[PDB]
Every structure is written in structure tokens, then in C-alpha cells.
């Protein structure tokens, strides 16, 4: 278990991030796997991949998820330059992320197709501090805890829709939650 940061563990970067509310658990297991419990949580974001990811890497991720609430499970990193915050969608609990949200295309891509949005965080906490920033999202039709998520599908189908990424920060398959409970053990590669 860890306090809230970034590192390396078992040759895997991970991400720890949580508003201080209290109720989530994070821990780190062997190679890529990574667990999260949380009961009346406030709001958290953890998992484990790469610093710097890429933009077309295919990620292999497996396990279970389980949420009581709202929670998204993803391909999740960001860019620089443009910033941009951005999600590959493949489960979430009691909210889809999208709801309300424009609609700028579809994909499919390892079996399923995804819808695709573009949202925006005004004032909102980041990688380089508070800023104004657009969200890039694949929302997965047909939800699912284990898979093959090959991000340069997404990356080439954004691109093509306008919504651009500058150069790649962190990216990993991580569990998000706002205010909820549930548990999740994932391994990634
Ligand atoms: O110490 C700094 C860290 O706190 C900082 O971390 C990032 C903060 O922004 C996080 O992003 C939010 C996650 O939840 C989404 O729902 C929101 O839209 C985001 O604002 C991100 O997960 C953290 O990595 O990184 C820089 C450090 O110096």
C-alpha cells in the first residue's frame, strides 16, 4: 500500500492521486498488477503503465472491477503541449462519462466500437497545476474488465477528428472514482 505519488514498481510506472476525503486503499502487486479498494471514497485516480507512454502502444490489461458507484475503468494519460487529459473508456459504474457530452465520432477497435467526446476542465487541478484543458474520450459500447486496448487506433481516430495530442506524458490503466466504493485487481502489460 502507498501514499498518494508516482513511481516504479516491479518495472511498471504507477500514479497515485487522491483528494485527501479518505475511504481508498491503493497497492501495489507484483509486475503489473495493482489492486484498489475503496469504500465512501471522495475522488481518486491510481493504476499502474508508462512515463512516458506512447502512441501506439497496445495494452493488455485483465482482472476485475468492481463498482459501487461512479467509476470509470480506463486507458488513461495525458499530453503536453497541447495539455489534454484523455481516456480509453472500457467499464465504468453508475455514470457514463459522456453523458452530455459532444459527440465527435466512433471507432471500433478490439471488438467493440467506441464512441468518441471532447469535454473541457476549466480551473481544474493537472499535470503542470491548475489549469483550462480539454478531455479526449473512447466510451466502449460493450463493456469489459480484461482486454486489448490498442491505442493508436484511438490516437489515429482523435487525430482525424481534430482532436490533437501534443507530446505523451504518463499513460496507464487505471481506476478512477468520485465519491463511491468498490474494488478492483488489475494486471497490466
Ligand atoms: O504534485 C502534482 C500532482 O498532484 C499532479 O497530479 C495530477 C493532478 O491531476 C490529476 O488529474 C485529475 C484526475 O481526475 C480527473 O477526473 C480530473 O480531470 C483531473 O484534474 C492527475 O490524475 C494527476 O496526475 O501531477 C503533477 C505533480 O507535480
Given at each position: 500500500?502507498?501514499?498518494p505519488?508516482?513511481?516504479?514498481?516491479?518495472?511498471?510506472?504507477?500514479?497515485?492521486?487522491?483528494?485527501?476525503?479518505?475511504?481508498v486503499?491503493?497497492?501495489?502487486?507484483?509486475?503489473?498488477?495493482?489492486?484498489?479498494?475503496?469504500?465512501?471514497?471522495?475522488?481518486?485516480?491510481?493504476?499502474?503503465?508508462?512515463?512516458?507512454?506512447?502512441?501506439?502502444?497496445?495494452?493488455?490489461?485483465?482482472?476485475?472491477?468492481?463498482?459501487?458507484?461512479?467509476?470509470?475503468?480506463?486507458?488513461?494519460?495525458?499530453?503536453r503541449?497541447?495539455?489534454?487529459?484523455?481516456?480509453?473508456?472500457?467499464?465504468?459504474?453508475?455514470?457514463?462519462?459522456?453523458?452530455?457530452?459532444?459527440?465527435?465520432?466512433?471507432?471500433?477497435?478490439?471488438?467493440?466500437?467506441?464512441?468518441?467526446?471532447?469535454?473541457?476542465?476549466?480551473?481544474?487541478?493537472?499535470?503542470?497545476?491548475?489549469?483550462?484543458?480539454?478531455?479526449?474520450?473512447?466510451?466502449?459500447?460493450?463493456?469489459?474488465?480484461?482486454?486489448?486496448?490498442?491505442?493508436a487506433?484511438?490516437?489515429?481516430?482523435?487525430?482525424?477528428?481534430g482532436?490533437?495530442?501534443?507530446?505523451?506524458?504518463?499513460?496507464?490503466?487505471?481506476?478512477?472514482?468520485?465519491?463511491?466504493?468498490?474494488?478492483?485487481?488489475?494486471?497490466?502489460?
Open positions: 500500500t502507498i501514499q505519488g508516482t513511481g516504479y514498481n516491479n518495472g511498471y510506472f504507477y500514479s497515485y492521486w487522491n483528494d485527501g476525503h479518505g475511504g486503499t491503493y497497492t501495489n502487486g507484483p509486475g503489473g498488477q495493482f489492486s484498489v479498494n475503496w469504500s465512501n471514497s471522495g475522488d481518486f485516480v491510481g493504476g499502474k503503465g508508462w512515463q512516458p507512454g506512447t502512441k501506439n502502444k497496445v495494452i493488455n490489461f485483465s482482472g476485475s472491477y468492481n463498482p459501487n458507484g461512479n467509476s470509470y475503468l480506463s486507458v488513461y494519460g495525458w499530453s503541449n497541447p495539455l489534454i487529459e484523455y481516456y480509453i473508456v472500457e467499464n465504468f459504474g453508475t455514470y457514463n462519462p459522456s453523458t452530455g457530452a459532444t459527440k465527435l465520432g466512433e471507432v471500433t477497435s478490439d471488438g467493440s466500437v467506441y464512441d468518441i467526446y471532447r469535454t473541457q476542465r476549466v480551473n481544474q487541478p493537472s499535470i503542470i497545476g491548475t489549469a483550462t484543458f480539454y478531455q479526449y474520450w473512447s466510451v466502449r459500447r460493450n463493456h469489459r474488465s480484461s482486454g486489448s486496448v490498442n491505442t487506433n484511438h490516437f489515429n481516430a482523435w487525430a482525424q477528428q482532436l490533437t495530442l501534443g507530446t505523451m506524458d504518463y499513460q496507464i490503466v487505471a481506476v478512477e472514482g468520485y465519491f463511491s466504493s468498490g474494488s478492483a485487481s488489475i494486471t497490466v502489460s
